[PDB]
Description:
Three copies of one chain form a homotrimer.
Chain A lengths: L19 H4 L18 E10 L8 E6 L6 H6 L5 E3 L2 E8 L4 E10 L18 E5 L6 E5 L8 E2 L8 E12 L9 E9 L4 E2 L35 E4 L34 E9 L5 E8 L21 E10 L9 E8 L14 E6 L10 E14 L24 E9 L12 E4 L20 E8 L5 E8 L4 E4 L6 E2 L4 E9 L11
Bound molecules: calcium ion (CA) (3 copies).
Amino acid sequence: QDLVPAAVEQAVPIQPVAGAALAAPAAGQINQIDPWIFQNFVQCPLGEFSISPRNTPGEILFDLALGPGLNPYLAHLSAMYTGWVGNMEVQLVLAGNAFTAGKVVVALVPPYFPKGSLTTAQITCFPHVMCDVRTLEPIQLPLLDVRRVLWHATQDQEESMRLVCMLYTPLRTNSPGDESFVVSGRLLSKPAADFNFVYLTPPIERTIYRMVDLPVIQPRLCTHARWPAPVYGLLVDPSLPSNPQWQNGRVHVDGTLLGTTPISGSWVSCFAAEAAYEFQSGTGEVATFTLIEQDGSAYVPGDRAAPLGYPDFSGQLEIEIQTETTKTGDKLKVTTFEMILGPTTNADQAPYQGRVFASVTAAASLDLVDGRVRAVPRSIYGFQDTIPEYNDGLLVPLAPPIGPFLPGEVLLRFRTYMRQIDTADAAAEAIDCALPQEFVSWFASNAFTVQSEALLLRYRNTLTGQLLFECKLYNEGYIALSYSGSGPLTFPTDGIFEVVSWVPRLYQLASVGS
Amino acid sequence: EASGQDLVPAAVEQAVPIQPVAGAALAAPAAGQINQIDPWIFQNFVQCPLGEFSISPRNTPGEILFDLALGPGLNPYLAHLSAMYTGWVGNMEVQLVLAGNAFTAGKVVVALVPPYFPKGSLTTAQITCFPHVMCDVRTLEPIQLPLLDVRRVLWHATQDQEESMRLVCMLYTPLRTNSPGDESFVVSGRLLSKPAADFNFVYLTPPIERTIYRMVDLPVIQPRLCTHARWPAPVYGLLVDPSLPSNPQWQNGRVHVDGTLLGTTPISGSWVSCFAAEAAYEFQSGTGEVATFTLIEQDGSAYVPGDRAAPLGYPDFSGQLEIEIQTETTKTGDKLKVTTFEMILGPTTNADQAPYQGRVFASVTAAASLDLVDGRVRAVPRSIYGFQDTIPEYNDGLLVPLAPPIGPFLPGEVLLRFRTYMRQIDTADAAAEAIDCALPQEFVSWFASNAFTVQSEALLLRYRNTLTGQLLFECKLYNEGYIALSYSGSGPLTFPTDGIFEVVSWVPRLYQLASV
Amino acid sequence: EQAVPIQPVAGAALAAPAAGQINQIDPWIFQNFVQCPLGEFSISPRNTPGEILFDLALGPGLNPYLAHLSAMYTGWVGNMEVQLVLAGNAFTAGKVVVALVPPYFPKGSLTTAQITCFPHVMCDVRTLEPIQLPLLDVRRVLWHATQDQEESMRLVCMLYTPLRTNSPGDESFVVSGRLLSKPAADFNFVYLTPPIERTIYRMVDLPVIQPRLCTHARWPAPVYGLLVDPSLPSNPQWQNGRVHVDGTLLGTTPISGSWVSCFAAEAAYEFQSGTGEVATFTLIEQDGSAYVPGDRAAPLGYPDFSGQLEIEIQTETTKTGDKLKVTTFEMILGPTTNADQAPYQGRVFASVTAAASLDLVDGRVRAVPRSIYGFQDTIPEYNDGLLVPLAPPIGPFLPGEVLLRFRTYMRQIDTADAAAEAIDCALPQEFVSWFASNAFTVQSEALLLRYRNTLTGQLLFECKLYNEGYIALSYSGSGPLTFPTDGIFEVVSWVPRLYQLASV
Ligand SMILES: [Ca+2]
Ligand SMILES: [Ca+2]
Ligand SMILES: [Ca+2]
């Protein structure tokens, strides 16, 4: 009587969701967009992901949220509106082989479903599409505005429908292996027929859904963020410790300054304090410094280990100060003082409590008048890359170690050389930073929104266009490279970084090496 | 229909000052699916999960008898169905049953409290400022009330709780009886509910068992087949005794109904009254061989003094405890042995012992210095001498964080005890030494591994006999983790250990239990 | 009214299906334009274009009657009508812009170019009639909650084109502007609830007590006078007598007046072979509690001045000539060190000038002040030479504003001159307790106050009470000026920080 076909094309059944019909009576305006934005799939700002045989079933490959942050045109247009309503459509492409086996599921997760941990059995209880990694053509899905409000505010994030993809079946290759074959995936989107904005406002450039960019300066023309010297090298080195705990040069991508890093590069490794001088018997002058901020304000013990720009390493410091004497026939001079920074004893060093001690040998009194001084670094002796004596021997608030790199990932280092006093070894002492200056700035000056876990960057030659490597910039302000060698590897410093897209935490980078 | 109607019958007085409220019709254009509830569910009144309450002549006006929040948690069908959705809307119908004796008198008020009204002290002056209904306790027919969805959103979320209309009942007039003989009656009221015409759910989601509503359940196991939570022995007795101290401060076997462990109670029953440590041995011409133990966690982790008086599973009583220890010796002929040590738990001794700092001392009498190598060991109990059921010293007389004493109880309520017997050394008395606990270890593991969500204040339990299927008594299980029942006798009372406990409903603290 | 590019907004028609009740308001309220709070400004020839003249948010708090009525309801909905009045003659020039800013626009600084991109109106200062505007309820919900502050439409007025005028030689010309409002025909309340007294639309008030019957917050003595003296330091850093208007205690101030300049501690007495007996105190809370160092310099009520004082404690002797006694100790607070006083860590030292052993027992004591020697108005030594967390100095003040001080006199030991002592405070202890127990809601930056005589009802002066808990007066003199201690302080209204007081 009836025939049931064995092969049916996949589709997602939906019930239509009302947009501006529900929002019109309570909104001030209903603003329509260009009719040709409805005709083209354009790559999402988060539009890159990867699949590897290192992955396991149940891992989330990506998750996207409905809103004007999925389309470059809509993200550009959102700067002159206060709200939005409507549905969208998403397209997915995978670059697979004929030798690869594997299945993924793309599901539609409603708002207010708890965001804990889904499993492979649960993911198929949502409206979904099952996709093979060998597909040649793109796959598309809808995104409806299931909501309890009349419309959404642009300037916040709120809660909306999500699009989550997880690895349903493990990725296998018939080849003996193991290789390092990676399947690339890209995402595109476009609004559906029932999308518009709410209220026409002036265009504000410093809005959310504004893409992050970087200053166009080569690394040679930059300033080191931990020692006052120009940047001289760019390298990766797996023989060095992997998770340092530097306190300077640390900034969040969204603009938060972590640790004791300042805004300007003239505050690095310097300090400002009120000085009092004394003489003991023959040891010379002893200077006690009560520390303040470099702009003249007062220092209060808080969530930082020291005033902004305080040195975060160990050794003996030779510094310069400006002094005035009460002697006859001699006005202001510049004096050199000796300082102890490393974890030691026989002194009471507590910059966390605003007390510092310095000294200089002298057979006379050479009395000086107390006042405000600014101390800058001149020379270093016995340098060690470890935190200083912030308190006497106690614990103070600190920025966390860098971490938590994926397997095979190493840290990119910007390298400069210090002025060092040595007797036997003539080698130049070297110090490293994660991000240079003018990168600490351009953050906290632009208040960006992260919208994802990492940023993909490409390093390129200026006048040739050759690609040197690609890297991941995490939201915590450090760069990772995929390198598996044993020795140091350096790179030319006349390149330019450029932003590609937002990528998730599990993204797999193309390997680098010699 | 009934015999002498010298009562109130129907409380058809409402004309409640409220407008009709729209339900699922406002949420249909904002949902991406079509959902509906089984039409037969809309056709009968079933008892709410919090559908039992009591009025006693010991309550005062202004006490809250029940308060119910609108949502899927008032109906067993709807609470089962809410595990596979994210969203609900609509109104409800509620039936209140309270038909006390004809010799009684009293009055209650049931009010409709809107969302966003602050919770806390609700006095008898304000409850009449709401849309309300006045009820006699002698009313024969059930009283029917509506619960409307007053809201400013289109629907609510099943997981996590939001602000909705409440239904609050407060005792307005004290309950008194007119009978000549010796007693005053108690009124037992019931609540039933069903959805209204426009109730619905929103979006189908995977069915997850560990949802917020669910229902608390207990393991199906007889008390005689369980293990004691304070001494490594089987449970032998189920008892109530009003001559023993009423508010003990035991540190082991304490667990919250939501799953939190309080005190020094371990997950496993093999950690009870045992400890793992690093042992260093020395010879003293007095006590003989002296062993110093620095205590660590039983799984091997480091011990850090924190918000607990001792490492998990440490003994919480007093006396002289004798234990067995595995030891290695360098004397030719013997390699491994089990040695018996003894140590004073309490009498507070000279100065000493500081379990809160991980220091323990023990000794064994001997003449020649036995060659013993320092190492890692685990000690388990063997015997007790001069047992006293009082907390020991942990900080050498200084205060330590402790679990609160068990309580409080309503007047006439006593604590139920699970009893076992310990191996004892005695010189002139041959009577067995007994030790009690509040819950067995199986219940502790069940609560720790299940992590339910509590609703009001306590659970009503009924104890049934497996052989004859006859209910023995009813008790209140408090959310803090103890059990109370009403008993007014003088001597101890014991119960058979062949029964099974069962959950009935959620009850508040002022629930009045029947005597036993 | 004027035409603006905006659509009509529905009120109760959208809230009625899901509301319980829709409640009506007195029809006489719809017939009166009442002054809005923070709805006045003045324009001077020296102002530059781009200054924000006002910005007010839609809600019940714009009208005193609706603010009163909101206490017996759960929600509200609807639009309002607004009137703007400007006072200038025919010989002026300049222009102003009033815009409609939507509920979720980011807060910040607007430029004169961006204000014209909203729905707006342009007005000349020569306008005769008041300018009428609508205030519409643009929202993503069905109604609002009375006890919660949500986002609503705002009305923002900026100076667009500067004022050009002539002025006489004695006074400078200004253009004054005021804003009034009333509900529109589509405004309603939601649900009849029992009235609440601790609502958010509650105005700040002060206790009706004369300052001569009050208590000093820094020294346990009655207040003997109030004054203003520009010669004294402008920005003191007192750690006592500091309270926020919303009710947050700052520094080390206690709630009770009996905790001022007193401390409780566990005492250990040991006889030194030199000067005499020495007592070491481990500080605790006055009511009895563990003291933990934190964001606070010293336990509540600890003295915040420098000098040498004497204390009296209850001591018990194990000898047989007595059992209980009260003796006077001696401790040093000023920045002279020599004993390593660390109140921040919770330990201090004291000594007595006595010979031989003076056996006592350690059973906890409370120390009260007796007299001060070498008093100095500087913070004591909390750490040996280190820094501690403490409250910022009092300020800032506008150009021409001075601090008003409540003065009291303390005992002394000085042997050279016997004129008087002097210790000042910002607010008395009664005001501190009032603000702590009331917990009001602050609106903008400051409150306008008035000092009047109780009987004749004459005005003495007017001042400004800042949110941080200090009073400022507009005084242009040189020497100190004292005031009678018989008046009563009264609250007038909320004022902005840049408010010009009348000179005293
Ligand atoms: Ca060297
Ligand atoms: Ca015995
Ligand atoms: Ca004097």
